[model samples]
Target: MRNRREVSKLLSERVLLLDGAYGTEFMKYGYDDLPEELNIKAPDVVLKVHRSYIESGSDVILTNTFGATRMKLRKHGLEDKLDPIVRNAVRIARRAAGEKLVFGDIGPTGELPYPLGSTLFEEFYENFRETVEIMVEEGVDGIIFETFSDILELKAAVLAAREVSRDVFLIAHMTFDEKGRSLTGTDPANFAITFDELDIDALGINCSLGPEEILPIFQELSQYTDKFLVVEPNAGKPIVENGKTVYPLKPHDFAVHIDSYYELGVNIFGGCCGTTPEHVKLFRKVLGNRKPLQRKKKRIFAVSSPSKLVTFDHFVVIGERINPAGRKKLWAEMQKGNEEIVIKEAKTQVEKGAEVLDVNFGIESQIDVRYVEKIVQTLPYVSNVPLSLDIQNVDLTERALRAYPGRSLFNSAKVDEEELEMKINLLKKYGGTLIVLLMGKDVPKSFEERKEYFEKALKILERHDFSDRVIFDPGVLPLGAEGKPVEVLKTIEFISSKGFNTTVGLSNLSFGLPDRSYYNTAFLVLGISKGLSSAIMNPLDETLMKTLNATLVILEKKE
Candidate 1:
């Protein structure tokens, strides 16, 4: 069980306990410097804290390496000792616990990524990769990345640990203000969904607010995620009193408030900042009195930017306005770098009832990949609709994907082995819902023909752990192309009937037709009747948008 999925296995039987604060206890002894130094200069001091939490019934204790990264160490003149300090930190925690779980703690880089800050994502990932490597080598049971304000920085650490080893148990917690958002504007629902999409072992709130003050945010978090919830609230609210930050939630109330979190199905419990062994003892006392609550699964189908979620519990309408397939004016503007219109395109679509925006900076020769990245980094500012980052080149895809804050769609992963392999790796690193075309090398004509590609694509996606993140396009060929609307409608029904999400490029159905809107609207209605989950169409078309909204209402009414 030690080398396996031991933490998840333990939670299945009963709630697991993580250790309480180490920094408060560190300061209590008058060590005003960083904690990582204690590992090298005073191993015994760090060991004393671990032993106290163990005696107080903590099943897991985190290493004194929260600020041990190379980024934070150089400020304290300990940069050259990164390896020895991190290695010794885990060694001390292990020695004190004997057999209890030791989690190597990783905190935020104290810097933000792009747009808001200048730190590149790779620089952040590099910092965590170095720390996680030493921790894993030092034989810690898992990694606990805590107190993150920016979700992108947290993502960098999670991906880095994944780069190290997938076997280690990973825990992540973000500090949210009482408003239920990170400093960078990641709301609780968005945070939960993003972390849920990343597939971490557990996710929840920690630091910032006390347990009693954080109940509303915690309860909100519970409604969105089915993943095991982790909560490590501050002992109390902090105030500058007597020249020190003070958190004053007494042990009893600190123990008392988290009961609501437990009732809402938090599986892993602990304390953050200002908490001591006495606080953990109180938590252990509370756990002894009640059985862990059963968590009811909540199905929230959504995609997102950093600040918002585009839920798909309703018929999703994706505005197809950014592509340059036939839009010469839009393409020309982009070629000249007049991207203010690109922002205009996004805003207009959302106002016209589009739930998502499809963005494609055309194709080779005409497109500037830098413009694609620039717009994506700034798109959510113009409109909150989750973007369909429609591009083909893997490098351009990643640049846009990494820059976009929340989970978004990685467009058009085809069934070709070469293309699928690359796209899968991209989506794997940057989490997103995949827009997959029901295509093979040869054009698909019938249900059986498309099904072969669809089925094979399903197997390939599952192999890479992206099964639920895919939305299948049902071969909606143009009218003048090989397949017609009737064939696409049947393909939509066939693929969608299996109970997976489906999408179609509605405008594709009426190619070469003079009255394209009429044909597109008619096919859209027919496809919806046949169970189309979403449609990528021009939301700017007055008649088409009206039909989409009216049809969506009727479809919801039918339910």
Candidate 2:
């Protein structure tokens, strides 16, 4: 079996070719069982389809496990057969894809998540995780989610794949209408914005529409994301002929739009429903040596938990109530190994419109290295929001980093040489946003001092190659500090002037003030307008939460 980065390496060089339809082609073989069961029952027919695609010169072959979820298979009384059937599907594909890639395919659970439907996220996540585990255990190179109409359902699959391995390549393709809107009302740009925060290798449209119809959607999608794009449109709109659904476009005619995708910066291109090995053969011939187009991204910072993405294009509220600084009850509970209060705190912040939670397990007596790992491990369950894990100890930071399942924001980095190298290495391994404080050998007293200190601190991180993943906090001091709140505002102004993302410890600026809410709310509005991407604050304050949500609405609408 190949290593986890197998598909990552292939994508960097040339357009990775994906195999055509497996379900439609499988139906031609007269198999009465669902395609997944055929993997165990009719291995010969399954292997033939895989071998045919390989013979057509495709670079990758997706397995025949689209509806292998227990929710789908249980209806057929074959739910007990999921593990064997999913494993067999990959083994068969691996045999066919001798020198190429085999991506295990998983689709939606067919049930909507939350208030919209009966199924919970845990149900969807567990179903996909079980199937993904079996597929990865069988040695597939990557996982591909196809024909997902609900973004939340697609999210469940992405989380399951990441839950299996952080390094494994994940590609999620959602089915969209002619207008590029999903059934759940997500547009292409919205989906692109959501998945751009995860470890997803590529995001694109597939299955519902033909090549011609998807071209416009893909073009619009390119404008939102800089991540590699993967598109596998249907052959054409299907029509019923003599009681059988048939696709209209031929192999040669279908490949006409391949160049349009290549020119629009697509990295992986292939076919969907009604597409055969003949269609894949045509795609391979035309995309001979063309390179993917270079798209300039206007956005800078993004962080996510496994389930959702919080892009910092606008104001993002990260809750600051999880710390043990002054919350005595929360501190004692945390030290005693009772995470119930902390979990409740995380959920409350999430309820108050917090996009991310600032988790601080770092009070002097309460500083247990293992304590950081436990909080990171458990917080995602009660709250769907992303995390900003605030830890000072590097070893404990590493422990916390590995334990958290999603990409979270590293709460801090300093100018000390030993500390710099340690944090940089952790950030590189975990892959998330790292907040850099503008304090090092000395604290900044003036606006120029803050700007200068920031540049010097940046050289330390950039020298070690932590440039793109770091966001500057620029040191938010209390109301009585040397330059007061002016330094914080100016620091953010300068950071934004240079096209970098910035944030602040929102409550810090209001410390020691009687009317803290008034100061925090007023400063938050000015901070956002002066280019603060996100802020860490107390969301339980209804006055503060209202201001935070309203500011975000203004920022997004202004864009």
Candidate 3:
């Protein structure tokens, strides 16, 4: 069996060709039974398909277990036969594989995650884990999860595959429409950014549009990630001719566009539904021993909702109204575990132009972890913006990060030894943005003092390659006292000068001051001049918000 390093070396040298559609090819062979059923009911026919693709010049062939997930197989009453079915898939592929590589083929579970469907994340993980574990034990060279239309489901399968066998080469693929959005509304760029920190060896697209229509979308994905790219476009749109369904693009027509993907740095090429062995033969003939292009690395820091990608290209407004800090009524409602007020605040902030919602459940020590998980799980479905989890309890933080589907903003991790390590580990496991506080136990008062903590945090974060995902927070001191707003502004400038993003709790800067909106507006203007990227403040202030818009316009911050 080939390992990940060997596969990586091969991919770097030339464009590897994968086999074509299993279901459609089986249909053409006059077998209307389940494609996976052929592994047991008709083993010779399965061997025939594998050998044909190898003879047609495919370097890699996927096993015939695309829809073999337990949930999917249960519909056909074949769940009890999963072990034998999955084992037979790897066995048959190896028999005909000769010198070619055989990858375990996995597909979507046919059920969506969370609010979109009743299935939970653990259910999807366990289902895929069981299948991937057996495939690894059966000795396949790798695993390829294809035809997934949702990123969350794809993430589950990728995580399971990684847990099963760290050495097996893993590839993940998602399908998208002509508009460049998945069925669940993830765009190419967001999709690429969401999985940038996962343990998959290659990322790809398949089963949505043909080669002609997916070129632009593939190009869009190439700009944001440095992963090995793979594409398996369908053999054009299906059409009916003489009462038989067929693809419009013939072998030569499909092969003509192979170089288009080759130029875009696609390491692997293949065909989806409606494609045949003729397509694979022609793809190989067109891409004759050409080396894959070296793509430039494009690293970016961004958080995502289910549908939208939020980058800090411009100033962002993170709403701070969901906290129960001073509101007795809100605290009472939350104490009783009522999430109505919390959900209302989340939705209203987005309507008022908040780019991300900040969720804090106050200083109550009796807070329920289940309630926290419920809020984290429900927010993405309700509001169409990314979330900032301002939670501090270690267990609660892990639960929140686990419940969230997309990348999040982990609001304000301290510089204490344990605190820093804990937050960094969580961010590494579940990809997200980290808000590192520029202090260890107490607040830093000046730029020189804050710089010490910043340097320490950067040193630790850099060791994990996590410095790029951080947004530094110079601590905010309350006004109406000995608060040094100028010193805070100086710290912001100092951080910006070193080419890193910064955020501040704008409301705390004016706490206990009369006519606070005036102070808040003036301080915001000063902070933006010092290069602030985002602020945690109340967006409900009409005059303050209007001033922010006019200030951004005058400063030429808008495109």
Candidate 4:
């Protein structure tokens, strides 16, 4: 009876009811010593809470292991008990669940990854991996990561859970503020866009706000992703009453506000923070047997940092100064492990209208993998923009992607079937946008060859449902070498005509040509008219930026 198909079949049939807050309910029952510990010390109490939700009409019950993650348990000197706590909780939930589905509950580690805090993404991933591995091994039907205030932390948890088992039916959620942003500054749309490509079954918002307050935020989120939606608004905002914090909404009021979510296409309903079984009972009674509404899938073309989202609505400038390709100073500094210059360049680029910064550490063979991790980790603390990891080494690329806190742009996947598949898998695992170079073994000389290569790559992307996550890069060659610059322009136009974003290395087009700025700036303007979405170029060029501004004004592309 413990089958993913049963859970999948049930979700397909109609709206499902998720159990309410276990910790809060435990406190109400006078057993409030780190709710997860109850699973080991008082398994009967945990069983009672699970049965309470099941009897109160919860179609799915989550194990009481929200704080049992190694990172979280280590804080209470209970790290050794993590295995027992999670295993016991799963068993207790299964015992009480009866015919209901059991989902392993996971919450944040109460620690932030680097740039926000000292913890690394690897630490977060390992913590969640250990927890999820145990849960999956013990036979949980699914995993629910809820109440995470940091989207990056939630992402790490999700990837870790996916690393454990893809068939376990994962649901990822982040707690948003009243203004619809996570504490680390991710808005609902950005949150949805960031996770839309990850291997998760559902995406949602939980905790922090009341049902009424979270409705519009959920609505905005719904527009960006077609994944099964979930919303677990707290039972109104917490207010201190008689020296104890309490959520304001009673069961009826909570259910009344939550009803609107079903209309918004929420597949699962649950409570958080201060809700009780009474809330789940009323929620189920009010939203009885209704099938989940089908939602129109939206392809959001965007990239994100821990705090910012850059949509491809207009031409985006990706600063090229961070690369150590032609810069000895940058190469030396990076080789010495000094990131001050890199951070300086990032700040300068953003100051000069560079929406995204491309990080490259010279020759991949010459660079240390730790430096790639360093840049990905350090950039967010200083810059409020997403990154384009232009690393060529597959191992280095994965290191950067693994360490990166938010959705990044993986630059220049080649047209080789094997390499393209590797990069696509990385994009799927880490959740990001990709820039696919329109050539395979070598840069194609003729427009016809370039177009053929592009078509082949497009077919691969379409087969993987990754067309929206792609930004095509038509290979650019120098005019000084009799390279066909016009061909690059034509390829950009072709890619854009097919409704995919296109970018180019502007400097490459003018390489070895005198007054390279003239050619670079002119080609950029032409590319924009041909529907260029972004370009990796020198943003510090005053004349180029001024010309770009004038072009936008002249073409009415930007206000």
Candidate 5:
């Protein structure tokens, strides 16, 4: 894990040069038309190309095993050569890399797994596992699962690598069509969500389009993932020259676009088909003096409500002011059915810098769920922050979620098995974010008990594969309450340290206390610094708003 960070840091500081266009490089060795066959017979020549790239200032070199998997190898009567090919590929790259990083190359198997094709899950897993084992044994610095068009295959690769080796880093790179979706129609957002859930070290796009064509797609990808972004675009589209397909993008041409990719938060840089040493050197020259902007401490986005979408570290909080909750005055206004009040309140929250707005229409005076629709309609017009619909009524929550225009969050469901499944279903149906509160039939009183509850919740969510969209809340307690506040604080600390998304209802912590805003504002700032992603609060509090802005500046400076 630490080595992964070190590599990522070095790449972010400068456009770490990566060897380019392995198949093209092989052309010079008389294996131009059938490079895949050389894995078994002419491994030395392939290894030599890798060494040349390194000698030319390449910081990272990929093994010449892009099509060495069982399925692709089978076509050339070399299916049984998976292990030898992978092993030699790794060894060769390691020799070439010397002190630099060597990425074990694992390309698409060329056969879709189950439902899509004849390949069974077990068979696919075995093949991937075998490939990973060979790379690990050969001491390759990392793995690059590239040109994968299917998300399921990418997931399998990630799972297989994780199961076999903890020391080797894995990067999953998918190839997208001109439409910004994979050949299988999975968009980059789906790739981001799925890979993030699997906890893959890095997720990216490679080998599909050229630099200029992939930029907009890369920007769209940035919206769906906060993970380290990697991009290895093909040198412009292929062209034919003297009976051979060639790429025309010069190193300088490629470097011009690398600058754009950097602005999109791409931390790791590399190349795919059609790249060459000239491209690598030009990339290095352009990137040598440039340093990545320090990682942003907070990422803010617009979802739908007045609250801005703020993510500090991994914690996510939705300001709860839009929800009427226990406020009778707000309920009375809603009874007269004036949604403008809620809309105005939501707008104020956004202007004050709330990351998310929690919308609830379960006020005592309003029994009809139509109010949720009203709030949803009005809020989006005023504020672009993401919405977190908070309602015990599942049907109502679903309605509001559907009405939401962009990515929004569903407030919560309890941590029981049945509810967990339902929450996951809701997430899939609405394609939104989620909040998971830690409290259940097994709810306990002590900090230890709370920790257990959180663990149980995390396990349930993970099992159902909903952990990526899920943010946790250990259930805030009144500071004036006996034994409860301390336990909640402990739970909060634990959540923060785990590097997961977390939220707290700031108003809940001050429930029976006098002049609670001061404590709420102070603790909110502390929480932001401690990895709280979002906070549910009364955005109307001027002091809290001012404090949050100052905290943002401080965090930005620190980053």
Candidate 6:
């Protein structure tokens, strides 16, 4: 089977038609019950449905393994048939695809894992791995893990697939309730971030809501991750009429809704439950000749100390030095419980042309959590740039996040599951941008491991539904200290390649080195060119400020 890039390229050139509504098609084949068992007992009927869709202009056909997971199969007395069932399903779809692409359908296991449910990680991983392995061995073109509600479960499935087969294309999709959040409260941003981190070939929404309901969610998802997005919504809400379920959307009507998705950057289109071959044909007709709109790329530059948000190709730098963590005088004053010093620092950063001011109140020397609330209320009056609450303590973060008037930024959190969930909830409840630190419980030892950790952090953010609000901090090794500046530069390059907004403490590059400003300014300029978003630095430094203005000109000219 071809890799995802090759398949995605083929899909981009023309609208790829995906097969429609397997459960609906199966119902016609005496499958009122035990539909999953047909994979082994009556494979021909399943194969014929795939063949029919393929013949009806489907460029990609999904196998009849939607409910074929071991857990689901158990209800139908086919739990032991997972391997054979998935293998046969792939073989049949491949035969039907004939030169077309065949996507292996891996649906949710219907059991949530861990804190949410009794299923442990091992049980969930084994079920997903077993199904994915069969599909990979049979040379399926891609794998679609669809209709997932729990973000953790979806991540586990993607990890399992990635562990064994680097060749098969992978798509991670979820079903959202009416509120545009998953059953587990995951919003669009979370879905996009998680999928991008895992490097899924395609990411999109499917199964739950109709096309109209998915459009806005799709638009929100588009802003978070730059990946090939797919949308396969149900025809419409189902209505019961004379003991049969009926859908309100006709094929052409459904095609019109899909056109809106295409305009919003959905490269692949199809239908879910209550759709048919006719709907696929209509989708092909509407989207076949239309070229995707080439949207202007948005660049986000981040450094250990600060971050930059670029829109319409314009840079907005957020200064990071105003926080009380590093300054001895400020720390001492804060330790003395002085709110004035913090407010003055905020004013200073703003005067230095910081579009946003990041406030780090995590210094253990200052134990008053109420001071965080004090700063949140006091800073907005003096500072024009938005506030970024930089506290490691969850309670303080939550308190400040809730008390802050305007949207704020939550600076820096590790990527472990627990921290991620907590951060996500805080962001969701309080509403703010997030700064994700690359280091987690397992601090990466090498550059590659660090890169992996960065990706993992992004995935964690996505799982928690915090992707769009996320900015990253790829750890900056101290300058001239060990392997030195080049290692820092390499880390910056890796962050840029992966397309993350990052910030670094600018002074760290010159740490333990004499005449640090020269090295600090030089690295800052290099980072901006390499997609450094922002830096946390003393705006009082003239040389660094000049370097930043000059770098902005270069960035502007390039744009």
The residue ranges of model 2 lying beyond 4 angstroms of the native Cα positions read: 1-17, 52-59, 67-91, 94-205, 220-228, 236-253, 277-299, 303-408, 418-426, 441-452, 480-497, 518-534, 538-559
TM-score leaderboard ranking: 4, 3, 1, 2, 6, 5
- Give RMSD to native, each candidate: 4.1, 5.9, 2.0, 1.9, 13.7, 13.6
Of 1 and 2, the candidate ahead on TM-score is: 1
Better of 1 and 4 by TM-score: 4
For every model shown, what is its TM-score relative to the native structure?
A: 0.83, 0.71, 0.95, 0.95, 0.57, 0.57
**How big is the positional error of residue 76 in model 4, measured in Å on the Cα after superposition?**
1.7
Query: How would you encode candidate 2's per-residue C-alpha lDDT over 1-559 as one tens digit per residue?
Result: 5655766666767887788998889878887567888988889999999998898878889899998989989978999998888888888998988978898898886776543565655577788889988887888887889888776567667877887877677888888887777766666765765567666878888888898988888887888788878998889977789888889899989998888888888888888889998998888888786656788755546776545667777677889998888778777877787767888888988987888999887463456655565567556644867789888767778777755645679998865677778887876655566888888877677788888777887788678876777888878778855437777888888899988888888888778768989999999888888888888888888897787678778777442
Give per-residue lDDT, candidate 5, residue 29: 73
Candidates in order have lDDT scores of 0.81, 0.79, 0.86, 0.86, 0.70, 0.71
Candidate 2, residue 296: how far the Cα is off, in Å:
4.8
Q: Worst lDDT window (10 residues) for model 4?
A: 1-10
- Model 5, 422-497: lDDT tens digits are 7677666545667788888754577787788788887887787766667777787676765265566677778879
| Candidate order (lDDT) | 3, 4, 1, 2, 6, 5
Question: Between candidates 4 and 5, which one is better according to TM-score?
Answer: 4
Clashes of each: 2, 0, 0, 0, 10, 19
- Residues 226-302, candidate 4, lDDT per residue (tens digit)? 88888888899988999998898999888887568987898889898888988888988898888888788676788
Top model by lDDT, which number? Answer: 3
| Worst ten in a row by lDDT for model 1 | 289-298
| lDDT minimum window of 10 residues, candidate 2 | 113-122
